[PDB]
Design a protein around this nucleic acid. Sequence first.
DNA 1: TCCAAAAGAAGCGGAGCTTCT
Length: 1095
Amino acid sequence: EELKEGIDAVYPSLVGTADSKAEGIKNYFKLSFTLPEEQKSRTVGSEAPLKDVAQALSSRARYELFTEKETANPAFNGEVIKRYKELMEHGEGIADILRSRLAKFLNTKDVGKRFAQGTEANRWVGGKLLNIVEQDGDTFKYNEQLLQTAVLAGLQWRLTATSNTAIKDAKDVAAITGIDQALLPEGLVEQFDTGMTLTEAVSSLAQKIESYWGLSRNPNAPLGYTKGIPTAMAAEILAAFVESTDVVENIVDMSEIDPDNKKTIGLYTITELDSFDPINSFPTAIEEAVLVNPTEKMFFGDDIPPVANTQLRNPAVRNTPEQKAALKAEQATEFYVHTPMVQFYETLGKDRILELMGAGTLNKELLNDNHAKSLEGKNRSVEDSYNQLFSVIEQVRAQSEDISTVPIHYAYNMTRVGRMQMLGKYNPQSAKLVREAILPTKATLDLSNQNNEDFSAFQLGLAQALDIKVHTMTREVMSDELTKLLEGNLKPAIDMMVEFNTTGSLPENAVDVLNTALGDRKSFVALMALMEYSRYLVAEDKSAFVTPLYVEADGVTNGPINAMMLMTGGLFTPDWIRNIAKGGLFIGSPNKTMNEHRSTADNNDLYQASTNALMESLGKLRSNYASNMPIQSQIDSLLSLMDLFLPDINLGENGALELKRGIAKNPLTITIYGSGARGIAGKLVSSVTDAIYERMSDVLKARAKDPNISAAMAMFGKQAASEAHAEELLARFLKDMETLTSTVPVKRKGVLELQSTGTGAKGKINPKTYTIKGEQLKALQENMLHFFVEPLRNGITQTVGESLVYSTEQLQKATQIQSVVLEDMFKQRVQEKLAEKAKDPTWKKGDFLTQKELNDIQASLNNLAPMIETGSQTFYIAGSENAEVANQVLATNLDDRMRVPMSIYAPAQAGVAGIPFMTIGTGDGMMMQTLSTMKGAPKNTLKIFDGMNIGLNDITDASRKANEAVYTSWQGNPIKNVYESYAKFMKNVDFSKLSPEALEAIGKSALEYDQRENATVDDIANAASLIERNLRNIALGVDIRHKVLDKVNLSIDQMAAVGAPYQNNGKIDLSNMTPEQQADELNKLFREELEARKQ
DNA sequence: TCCAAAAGAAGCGGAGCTTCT
Ligand SMILES: Nc1nc2c(ncn2[C@@H]2O[C@H](COP(=O)(O)O[C@H]3[C@@H](O)[C@H](n4cnc5c(=O)[nH]c(N)nc54)O[C@@H]3COP(=O)(O)OP(=O)(O)OP(=O)(O)O)[C@@H](O)[C@H]2O)c(=O)[nH]1
Ligand SMILES: O=P([O-])(O)O
């Protein structure tokens, strides 16, 4: 252990003594880090990192010599070198700001003088950077090596951080803001998704800094310093970037939104470089110069990504061997640029792509304020995708003379729910714009005869891309629907694209031509279809047409169907047989396809089935209050308002209700996964208000074109036949808004009662500022909840089955109870350790625990089985990083601001997370994993979780393999996996040890409401063990069901489009039987199997 | 209670209580 000597030799002049027991100032940098056995950073040992790296960046020859490589990325040319020269000079400016900020900190309140006199200011939350200073006469100065290396990290972060951030949705913004998700003001989500929170910015910066410093953390040093020092440095660099205007800080006052929200929340936005900045073409020169093993880079040719050892953001969970094999397979796939699409995008240009695929130029006064904010977010996503694609294209273009010949590989990792995620925001898996420009799919096709199988494959790809629902009709019928479209409405766009694929020119009205031809079929993949068909038309050799056009083998109501197959536990029922067939499990129908099912047997998918059940439940609710005119009227008004604005709700002239599957799509999915009804009500209301705000811009558009337009024709002219007819749609609108905001349903003793809000809407509508908000939004939500969402939930349960609902409830309860215990025991062992440390004279409050101490606490929980194992996947439901364990500031900047909480990897309560973790994981996650690793695994695909893009040459075999992979996943038993973990947990848990908080948390899950109050430890223990029994019985039923199903003749077409179903070749023939007959025979086999078990 | 990543700021003082034009 000559590690102390080693690091002291590199940093001999840092203030203090590297001995935790020494009496004076102790140096916590040298106490916290060691030199690595093998070099990680080329700046370790450098007297002047900025000068050294700037010299390295100054020429190709110098770069190659610094990095010890033969050749540099060809994108690193003269123009890029000139930009890095200028960036390096800016690095000097950042360094200078930092030095001045230190000087100010040392001067203020005599901190420097006191520090020199022995005040341990280096251990304060704002003084941890004093661990990297050196005595300088009557003052102190930064160690230049550590300062300059940190600045290099700062520069790289500045270049590429924005592109690397997570996407914020409504739930994220709700957690951040503390505002109820259903009540988030319009445009707030966009505001927060465009910026980084303090924790987001500092943590990403701190990671980079620690990486570039290139040392290893001492396992026996307190986290207050190992995490604290790089975090303190990050905070200072963020502050310096704010001074330099590289970063804008915006402190958002929540009280202007919710007046009793006291939170003021910092948002940090990096100043964007010009889209045409040469540095965009190679933004990682610093990273690839400093680090021996760079993270940030593109992988060209045979440069392939390494395989990740651990689950994304879950370092306690190693990727299994099967998972690692899947990752290797996906990373091995070669992606290539499709030049025609790149040229098309380029020729249209950014402005016209925004006009076509976004919202175009916004006239902020033909626009409702709320609608305007939604349109800004639409533009932002498309624009960022476009810019990112072209930066990537510029880098590819440097690699060779023919950009279409340059292989590209992408890094992937497994997420906590077992999905293979392509790393990055703007890649083929995540970004539709990019997905049509960079593809692994490729085929050489004989399209000389429109009767070829090759031409049929080509047609299928075109049709699917053009929004023909290819899984709902046979290949033959598809062909005719496509032909009708190509020769009809799409013809003008095809002609335009033929001209483009001849001369390279587009007409001035290109956007209008595409818009009018496509209508609601418009998408990036639709643009690919127009491109590829027109290319075929002009092709000189149609017998060898080369195209990346693909067919997606795409899951049919995938999550719900997987849940039903994986977690239904009872005897077989005929309703279940009928409903599961809607997802492509066919019993007694050899070689049956989804296409045939939809066309000849049942045109109603699982969404339509639940929508139909909603119509029944709604009808019953209307009957239970038949005599109640106020209630009937309130329901009518809700339905009227929805009919006005949503395509999926239609009221006929005689009051006949038609609901389309579209309204049940998200509600169905999220309900199984443990979503409450209130959140669904919120989302349905948001869909309505979105449409209202959109219609208000339609009004402003009408008025400007025609000053003497009536308010009725302005708002309902596109929807009506006469002027007075538009007047009745307007009368409906104002009547509906008044009654739905001034009156709400409340459930009192099971019966719905109407209550006045006192906060009804009325007054002249100002279409520009019109906003539904606060108490008015709450009211619309309460109406939606009781008169629509509740019936829908009843319909959903009827459709997926009460048995599945029971399984998911037991799953939720078991995993929640386990997570509560894990969280509480981890916290107690931490608190017990802190009580010991307080007796240690070397320890100070704010120093936390060491990594060794934390690992020992993590290891101590292992007899509680925190991990779920399936044999090929590992799930850690409780795994989190949170600020609650340490409950303290980690570091601040030198102005006593940017106070970053100390976050710790620790178990936290699951809530309902167990349901989606296991359903997604053992369903689509296992499917894809299997597809990547099975015998004859399809090559050259793009997997997107529950769909896989396949090149036209291999659509048949790849689809059949996909259906086989579904079948393989259907041999899983997630409840059994949960049971095995929970049973071990039950063997080792002591409920008497839990805090009354944890004990209450468990009570809610394990006990009926009337029993929470004050039940005993032994009560909740006995209730928790009953859940173990429930799990065991469910797991047993599932096992039997899968075994029995596998004995029978099955045709599986869940990954549908192509009509290539997987046959299980089970030997019991259930053909020419009704579902009732089939249920009887399956239940006979079940009881047979149950008897073999008992005997 | 849907999931795939968390996540107030800042004066005084040197942690953690306090207050929030
Ligand atoms: N908890 C949960 N799960 C959700 C969900 N929406 C969907 N899921 C899960 O995915 C399957 C299949 O859904 P699908 O729409 O066919 O395919 C999606 C999906 O796999 C994934 N995805 C989008 N949003 C979410 C999400 O909010 N959560 C999760 N876990 N997954 C999501 O991405 C696929 C779409 O990829 P693509 O870029 O091609 O986009 P599309 O062309 O489909 O159009 P777009 O609007 O962008 O999606 C479900 O059965 C379920 O298990 C949800 O809200 N919550
Ligand atoms: O066109 P699809 O949605 O049936 O694959």
